[PDB]
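Summary for the steering committee. The consortium agreed at its last meeting that each partner would contribute one worked example illustrating the joint modelling workflow. Our contribution is presented below. We chose a case with several input lines so that the handling of multiple components could be demonstrated. No manual editing was applied between input and output; the record is shown as generated.
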Amino acid sequence: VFCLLSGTPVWRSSDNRSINVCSQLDWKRTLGIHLWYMLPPTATVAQALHMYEQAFQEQEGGEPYACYPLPPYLEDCGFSFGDDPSAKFISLQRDVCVHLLKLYSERQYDLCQLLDPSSATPDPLDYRLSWHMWMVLQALNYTHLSGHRQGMLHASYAAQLENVGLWE
Amino acid sequence: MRRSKAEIQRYVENAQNSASSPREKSMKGFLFARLYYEAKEYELAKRSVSSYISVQERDPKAHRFLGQLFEIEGNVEKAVGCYKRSLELNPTQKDLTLRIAELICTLNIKDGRAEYWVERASKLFPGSPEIYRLKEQLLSSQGEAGWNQLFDLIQAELFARPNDVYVNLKLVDLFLSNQRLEEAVLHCLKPERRALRTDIEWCSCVVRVFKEYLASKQGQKNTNMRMITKELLLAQCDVVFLTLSKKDVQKSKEALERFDQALLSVKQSVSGTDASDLSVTFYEMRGHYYMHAGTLLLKMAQSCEVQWKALIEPAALCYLLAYQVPKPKSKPVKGDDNGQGFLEELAFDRQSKSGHLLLTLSHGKQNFISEIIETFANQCGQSILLKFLFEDNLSMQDSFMGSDDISYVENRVPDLSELSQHDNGSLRIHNGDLQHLTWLGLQWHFLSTLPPLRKWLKQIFPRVPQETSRLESNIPESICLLDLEVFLLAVVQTSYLQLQDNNTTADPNRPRCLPLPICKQLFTDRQRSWWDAVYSLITKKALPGTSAKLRSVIQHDLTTLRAQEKHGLQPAVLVNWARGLHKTGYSLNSFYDQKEYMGRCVHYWKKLLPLLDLVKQKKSIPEPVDPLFKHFHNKDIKVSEVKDLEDEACIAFATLDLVDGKTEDAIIAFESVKNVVAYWNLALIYQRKAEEIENDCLPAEEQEEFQECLLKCKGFLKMICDEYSAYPSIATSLPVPVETVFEMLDSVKQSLGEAMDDHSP
Amino acid sequence: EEIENDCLPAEEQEEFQECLLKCKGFLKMICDEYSAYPSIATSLPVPVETVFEMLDSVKQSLGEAMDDHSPAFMENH
Amino acid sequence: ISESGAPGRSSLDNVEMAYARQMYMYNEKVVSGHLQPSLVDLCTEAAERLDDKNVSDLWVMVKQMTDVPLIPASDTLKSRCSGQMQMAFVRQALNYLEQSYKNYTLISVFANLQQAQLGGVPGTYNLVRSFLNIRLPTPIPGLQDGEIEGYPVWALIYYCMRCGDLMAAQQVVNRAQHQLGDFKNCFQEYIHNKDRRLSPTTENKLRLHYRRAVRASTDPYKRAVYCIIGRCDVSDNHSEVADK
Amino acid sequence: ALQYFYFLRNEKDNQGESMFLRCVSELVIESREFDMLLGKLEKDGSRKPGAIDKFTRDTKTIINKVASVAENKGLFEEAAKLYDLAKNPDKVLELTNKLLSPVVSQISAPQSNRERLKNMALAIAERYKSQGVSAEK
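What follows is the complete predicted structure of the assembly.
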């Protein structure tokens, strides 16, 4: 019953350990409880993200047993729970909230292989909110020198608009 | 990876929710196959693999995944077929061929195609002990056609790089299986095995092969049998040394028993044939047996058995016997130089170790050697030593001490020059080691004598100039022998804490300075790794890819060790280094060496100044980053030594000005400093001035100047003699005794004339 | 001189012998270059007499006396 | 031109951004005090992660060439004044050029696949034979003695020399028993000796034979092989001046 | 900027001062910003561990040298703010007197902005003296 609240930094050896937050539930309420009753309110969002990364990462010293925030397209539409970036970069899609928080923090992180093409949808089509956010970021001057992405996104948007029946 | 049935089920449902297209679900089948394999659904995994192939066929990654899945399942034929399909598609990854060869070796197929595939996999990957054993077993089950390819591959690997201990053992086993003692001897006679003879199984196989070759050639008398027996005895000694260095007692006792049996068997070789080199060989065997007995006795003493003195006395007697063993002289016959050079090197190393151990055990009293000789060199002492070693087993006639009734041994004290020569000869074959250098420094510090580290470093390291160099670079030009000696002295001073404590807390008598085979990490693992990286960088033998990390680590730790960036070392070690550098510069007369030592001392004072300022603020020195010094904040200095450190820095700057050329500045500094060392420096300056004046012709004005200089030197020597009569600490503070002072005073008096006596102005 | 002012171990003695041999060879090639073209007599701030005297002193300290390398009563060969 | 500093927040290059981030992590580790690995490996992994491939392979080559067991010098003046490090770097550059030719042969094999005029077969000797069959499978004019499975032995030896596969060269020599003259032992010694020790008298005899007879044959590969073996002249060109 | 300074600081002194110091001085006098790089200020607070401060030490002396260079060049308000951040009442009062001395000779009526600048500088100096230890007697 205690496994829900305090939750010290995760440390596993090779036995059977299952603690921290929620213990294999929904990532939304998991992160909610993590922000509520885990770290003290003096901590920041960056510290909470680093703690969650050290929690669901395999670099803690053994085997993780938590969950990873999956990109929600409908009802938890990602790939597995509790996977370090080294095991996610193969093909597993990363989170969107973590990417947004990292972009708000500093724009000095890698963005070429990040940013999933899915605009919170199970299908990769419809680049509405994604294009809106990208244009807002380009106007606020926070992206990077890479015109190929903008070109392919504009081409895909023009194709979708000419398919649905729009010109202007 | 916390995975269960419901966990895989919800993973599958979340992946299904992440795909709104049938072809997208089929493309994501490379993960669905793994999920079904984890959930134990082989048919569903195969269906997902087929669905992923139907949308993206002919790809190496999917074929490799399917082959790995089939291999983990058990379908060896299906895995081989998938790997063959991937190879005929695109043979970019040799892992397919490696796994094909592994499956073929596990299935044991005797066919030309299997032999060709094994040869191709061996040509691809020459390493990996698993695949090496697999291909060895396959080519041994094959026949001679496969053994030829195995021998060719082994020769190619040996030419590319030094082979492995297990590789050589398997090769010698395959040789013995087909009975090729001549080929085995021809392959083992290469000198490239002196560093690989560190495997017990390999050495035992070599011994067995040599014994078989001797039994087969029992009928010919040549130097080949003699050198083979010498190599056998060397391998046995190496096995005993390895067992003594290992953390086992039963294996060490078994190796000691085997060495005793080998010595008993070789005792007849002296009376047999070719006794010339065999006498020196038997002497080396006796010395090695004594060394092993002493090592086992010290190991039992560390493990606590009986009385420390009753265990030191037999070990000291064994060391004395090994030292009294006749040294290797000239060789009347030749042909066994390959088997005699290493024997002579080991004999010199044993002599040096025995001398150092006897000196450290005798400390300063030389009567303990004679006491041990008169006490424990009897038959009762030998029986007690045997009962302590072998737990009263075997027999008395197994060793030379039991074969010949040794009752009294001649007294002998090791000489300093002989010990230095033995240590140099040992280091010439040891190529230097951090632990050995630290042990030597600790022994010399306990004996209270300046260790000749310069010759040792010049022998075990490339010769570098000792002039003014940098200190923030890992280049061997900056990493000088003086800096290496300073680091070694620091390591010795840090390790001296363990020798001072523990031993004295247990008992007033304790065997100080443990030998090499039973030596642990007395310093620090960080310093050990740093020294290993420095040695690898200076020898140019690191692994390609790790040399960059090694040099980066060295460059990072150099600024913290030599105090160049932000650090936090202790003031005591810095003061000790500065004092040692100043003493060495004052002792040596080399201009460049003295200038370099003075520059190092000035840099150390400049780096200590902030530590002194922090201490003056009633703040202790924090702990240094990375464990490298045994002294912490508890060994900090007080505020009373500030004036002493300031006076030391002042006299150091005065010596710097004197060695530079500022004669008047050095004179006024030595006059302002109220040190007897400063007074002696002024007296030496006056004496050298009088000497350089007298060296030239003295017409009249130069004669008067020389007379005035002689009067000044006579007054200074009179005041020095008065100070020495007031306090007899002059001979202890200066490296020159009072005999030379009295001699130079009498010389100055005679040069001045017969108008004054001793102690005259 | 700075080495002889202190002790003379085996390594220091070998280094001193090597330095003396190198100095003898340097004086020999100096004499050769001086005998080559007369520009050395103008570009040299030290006369050849002192160089020859130092070479003879170095040879006498080494112990050699043959004419195969740096003779006695002549500089070149 | 270059990636200059934009006024405030704007848009820079991903390569420079990742390099600045890695330098920031390096400075953080320096401030922490733990020993850092090496920034070269971090830059290599960043270039491999990035979408750029040409500069990534270029930096991989630079890293593999700099990861040679050489002593770190202080300046270019000291590096050019030291003589041992110069010849060591030259030997390492020759070895890496051989390795790069082997990698180019492997890439050509991967491009030619398997079912295309005897594709690449696992194993060094088999890969060299496949590359030879892809380049010139027909018997080149100027053949001496026999052949190995109908393949030019001289061209095979030249390809093995250019690739640096000494074990494959040894295998080829062992296979060419009666398909060559009485120089198989000389070839074996030249392969087994890293310092090239195959008797000075034999070397002089081979040089004399090359200067006398082997000076106008129609086999450029055989001519180059004999020239390399006999150690003649400083440069011997036959048909390599063609963008290679 | 800090990534380049990490490499510029490796060079020692070359004909007075250092190239790294000259470069950072030029950059700070061209940027004129330190509320997050060197430290924020409420009204007369102390210094804060900025970006360069979290990697390099001697920040107080660096800020003092930068403010001295700015004063020698021709900066007043920014140099005063930098010295107030570095906590140096002696230098603050010295620069205040040095900037108010030449304006005393001319008129002091509200006609431009120099009078408002000297008034706000005097207010900052007096509040710094009230909240904390002032200068010498």
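Chains E and A do not touch (no CB pair under 8 Å). Helices of chain E lie at 2-8, 19-31, 59-73, 77-86, 89-105, 114-130.
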